[PDB]
Design a protein around this ligand. Structure first.
Ligand SMILES: C[C@@H]1CCC[C@@](O)(CNc2ncnc3[nH]ccc23)C1
Ligand SMILES: [Cl-]
Length: 167
């Protein structure tokens, strides 16, 4: 039993809700919140910009030190950093950005990072400003993640289309 509330159950291990991931994180304080990161951990917009703003830029400060030490992530890769005031940990995961020409097949590799954590609060990878089809992203999530994932979909209209079209 966990403290996630109001989710629809899609499969044994995947759940979905219309919610602002920032407000969800502040309420649940989950063990792991997933950020929709880029390889430079430049949290300028989308989910990343919103999460970073909620940390008063502490996420960006930590991220800049991470990059200065380790260099950029790989597309499809991840790193674990602090969750600041939002969660215990933040799993920064880089899904392919279609608006940069990146290979959509890497979306499965991106979701594989979730399997290293028993429970996560997460957005749909490569959705939003990353340019991929969110219906496809949900399908890859369900077919790749085996741990317990709670998906926050900010757009209510998008949420209803994902539920109604889910196979
Ligand atoms: C319009 C987007 C389409 C793709 C799926 C999204 O859910 C991804 N963006 C977000 N998801 C959850 N919480 C968020 N807070 C701020 C941004 C954000 C919504
Ligand atoms: Cl977005």
């Amino acid at each position: 039993v966990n403290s996630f509330s109001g989710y629809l159950k899609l499969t044994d291990n995947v759940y979905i809700k219309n919610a602002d991931i920032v407000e969800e994180a502040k309420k649940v304080k989950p063990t792991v919140v997933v950020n929709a990161a880029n390889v430079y951990l430049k949290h300028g917009g989308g989910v990343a910009g919103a999460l970073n703003k909620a940390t008063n830029n502490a996420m960006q400060v930590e991220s800049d030190d991470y990059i200065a030490t380790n260099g950029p992530l790989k597309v499809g890769g991840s790193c674990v950093l602090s969750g600041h005031n939002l969660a215990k940990h933040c799993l920064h995961v880089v899904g392919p950005n279609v608006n940069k020409g990146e290979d959509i097949q890497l979306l499965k590799s991106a979701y594989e990072n979730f399997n290293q954590h028993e429970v996560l609060l997460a957005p749909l990878l490569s959705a939003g400003i990353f340019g991929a089809d969110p219906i496809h992203s949900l399908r890859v999530c369900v077919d790749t993640v085996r741990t317990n994932v709670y998906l926050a979909v900010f757009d209510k209209n998008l949420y209803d289309k994902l539920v109604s079209s889910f196979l």
